Design a protein around this ligand. Structure first.
Ligand code: NAG
Lengths: 24, 49
């Protein structure tokens, strides 16, 4: 049994309040 | 054995220290003081200075 994952599995890499930003 | 400096036992310790995104944890002996908001403060928090 299978699916496309879609946009899932992200997790917080670090404990920093970065905000209103696109960051790599 | 003491029969052997070249071949005699020497203790070694390596201390390795961490600066993660986490709050700090293993701390020096220094003394805390009051949070003087809205003035130009020199600061240390946890070595972050
Ligand atoms: C997943 O991959 C298999 C082959 O490995 C394929 O038969 C199946 O249709 C795929 N399913 C999806 C949801 O992409």
């Amino acid at each position: 049994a299978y699916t496309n994952s879609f946009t899932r599995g992200v997790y917080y890499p670090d404990k920093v309040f970065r905000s209103s930003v696109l960051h790599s | 054995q003491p029969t052997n400096v070249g071949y005699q036992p020497y203790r070694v310790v390596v201390l390795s220290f961490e600066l993660l995104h986490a709050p700090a944890t293993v701390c020096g002996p220094k003394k805390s003081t009051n949070l003087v908001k809205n003035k130009c403060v020199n600061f240390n928090f946890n070595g972050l200075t």
